[PDB]
Amino acid sequence: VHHVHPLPDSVPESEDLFAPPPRMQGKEGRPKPHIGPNYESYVKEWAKTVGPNSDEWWAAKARETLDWYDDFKTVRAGGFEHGDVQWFPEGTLNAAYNCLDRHYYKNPKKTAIIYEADEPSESREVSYEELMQETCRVANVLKSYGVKKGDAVSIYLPMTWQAAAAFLACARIGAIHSAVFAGFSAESLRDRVNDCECKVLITTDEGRRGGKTIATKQIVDAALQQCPLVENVLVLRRTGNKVPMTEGRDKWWDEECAKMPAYCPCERMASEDPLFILYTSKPKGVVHSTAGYLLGTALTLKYVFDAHPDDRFACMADIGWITGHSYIIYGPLANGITTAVFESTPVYPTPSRYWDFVDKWKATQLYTAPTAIRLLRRMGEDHVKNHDLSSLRVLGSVGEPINPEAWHWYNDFAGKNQCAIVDTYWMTETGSISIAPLPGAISTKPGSATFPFFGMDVDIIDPQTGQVLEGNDVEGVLVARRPWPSIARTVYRDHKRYLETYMKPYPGYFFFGDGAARDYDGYMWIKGRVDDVINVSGHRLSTAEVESALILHKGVAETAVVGCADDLTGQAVYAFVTMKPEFDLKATKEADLSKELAIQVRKVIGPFAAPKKIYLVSDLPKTRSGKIMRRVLRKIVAGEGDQDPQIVEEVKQKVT
Ligand SMILES: CC(=O)OP(=O)(O)OC[C@H]1O[C@@H](n2cnc3c(N)ncnc32)[C@H](O)[C@@H]1O
């Protein structure tokens, strides 16, 4: 009789525990896991990484994992209270040296980047030699513009391989890159370009994604009319179609680079020099420093994905997201392996694209978001069932709770029940993965992140008392007790917002902003955003709970639940429901559908959790990174409609 339940699943709990499969046991010729074979092997190593004697392990990992120009003396200092976190502060290094040069010197012809172009036939392999040469040319171009160590440089590039060169060119010279999702509006770009006070911007003439053109240079020209500090724009000729160019201000990437040497020295950076600003969707400029962030991405890539030297790591996200920062560029390249830069969408030209890609390149790990998974689940198993896919050993999911229904579709079809599924919980502000199974050690539960990564010591606080809940079978809000190497160091020029958002809600701790539970086995369950909890008559419902109930119903593709004021219950659950496209809405009475959905939620969660209203909609408002914008739904249901962008107009109409 447990207080904490797993996310609703149609599989009974007793048949729902997944030991590392043979591909993660060193069988069938696969590499032996770095950590394994059981929970105890994870604990035995994890315990070295937290607490009063963890400096020894961190100093050793720091020294074994990165090439340093100057050694460090102190392992860590500072803390949450004033936001003065420090790691390896006396050391010096360069992120570009660690992600390129050192691997170029060992095996220059090894592939750094699998460039999977929007059109499959234009894909190709980019070696470490080629990536480094292009990075050095661009660095030299930036130096020629007068960019100095510590200057900010904005990046508005789509998912072409040169995006990594632009990141690493900034890192190479100590410039602070600020990457913005290609396709963000001129207004969103202007706000982020203005906030970081950059003088140089790197972009493309046009982007291509899913057979559509992103008019990047045209968007840039609109933003720059309200960005008085930008003096130089470097324009990558991605499509070659005619775009406006401003004399003096704008230069073609290829023509600037052709004038420059193909080597450029590395600036020697202090461990705590800023490496980048990454605005989250007022715009919050999240700042990461250099050594701790790089170390955290290198270690998490290695251990969470059990990366080995010949691996071909395929993270399918966008470099505008922290996920692309940490697990397309920095993490994999720091480890010297091969990494995918995926330019297209999961369904272009067909929903078989991910799997055609895996079998073409023999990818050994695939990493994507629940939104993509549920998208492909909606599209039917014909596009996946007849692929090989046996080069994969680890399938990861990042960005939101993964409903057990989607977890199982991932495990059965993408993994053919032979891959480990790593559900990776973290945030832009954590730098690298915070809670995840180690795939060779941890028996997984559908929808659970399982146990904290090395250096992470997390706790559950009761938000109603402000006090920590000791033990297992407890739920509340997730906090961390101690800094870890890759935590964000500030919000750019707004340190007060940093302290107030993360350090002040529960003094002594870092506050993630997510509801969480630790079950009787000690497994962590991230249940959704705290802001998204719905309090019905005292019962605190999480989004992941109710949404996982609704998706147990045949035909349901995706849902989102938001609360709203109710005189009788305090708050009422309103559900927005997306059905598969072939589901006959005329042959099933809408009222009949919502009655069955209500009964379904009442069975697996309780009599109080049924939605007061259900809205059938064709899609849900989502961000570029695939987050469902529940805050948008909540505000429309609250009648505060004034406070795929076309999807908002549809919701506002169905609710009225
Ligand atoms: C990496 C990233 O997503 O960065 P970011 O864009 O900053 O979002 C952070 C928010 O995403 C949610 N989130 C991300 N991964 C999750 C997971 N595996 N399980 C449950 N929730 C997850 C949480 O709510 C986070 O607080």
UniProtKB/TrEMBL annotation:
Location of the AMP-dependent synthetase/ligase domain: 101-484
InterPro entries assigned to the protein according to its UniProt record, in alphabetical order = Ac_CoA_lig (IPR011904), ACAS_N (IPR032387), AMP-bd_C (IPR025110), AMP-bd_C_sf (IPR045851), AMP-binding_CS (IPR020845), AMP-dep_synth/lig_dom (IPR000873), ANL_N_sf (IPR042099)
For the protein in the UniProt heading, the enzyme class is ligase
Assigned keywords, A-Z: ATP-binding, Ligase, Metal-binding, Nucleotide-binding
Binding annotation for Mg(2+): 81
Q: Name one GO biological process term.
A: acetyl-CoA biosynthetic process from acetate
This protein's GO cellular component annotations are:
cytosol
- Where are the N6-acetyllysine residues found in this chain? 627
Enzyme Commission designation: 6.2.1.1
Name of the molecule in the record? Acetyl-coenzyme A synthetase
Q: Which PANTHER family match?
A: ACETYL-COENZYME A SYNTHETASE (PTHR24095), ACETYL-COENZYME A SYNTHETASE 1 (PTHR24095:SF14)
Reaction(s) this enzyme catalyzes, per UniProt: acetate + ATP + CoA = acetyl-CoA + AMP + diphosphate
Task: List, for all copies, the residue spans of the domain called AMP-binding enzyme C-terminal.
Answer: 545-627
> Which residues take part in binding ATP?
281, 428, 529, 627
The entry's family comment says: Belongs to the ATP-dependent AMP-binding enzyme family.
Q: Which GO terms describe its molecular function?
A: acetate-CoA ligase activity; AMP binding; ATP binding; metal ion binding
Does Transcription count among this protein's keywords? no
Occurrences of domain Acetyl-coenzyme A synthetase N-terminal (ranges)? 53-99
Q: Provide the binding site for CoA.
A: 209, 318, 538, 602
Q: Where is region (Disordered) located?
A: 1-35
Q: Which Gene3D superfamilies match?
A: 3.30.300.30, N-terminal domain of ligase-like
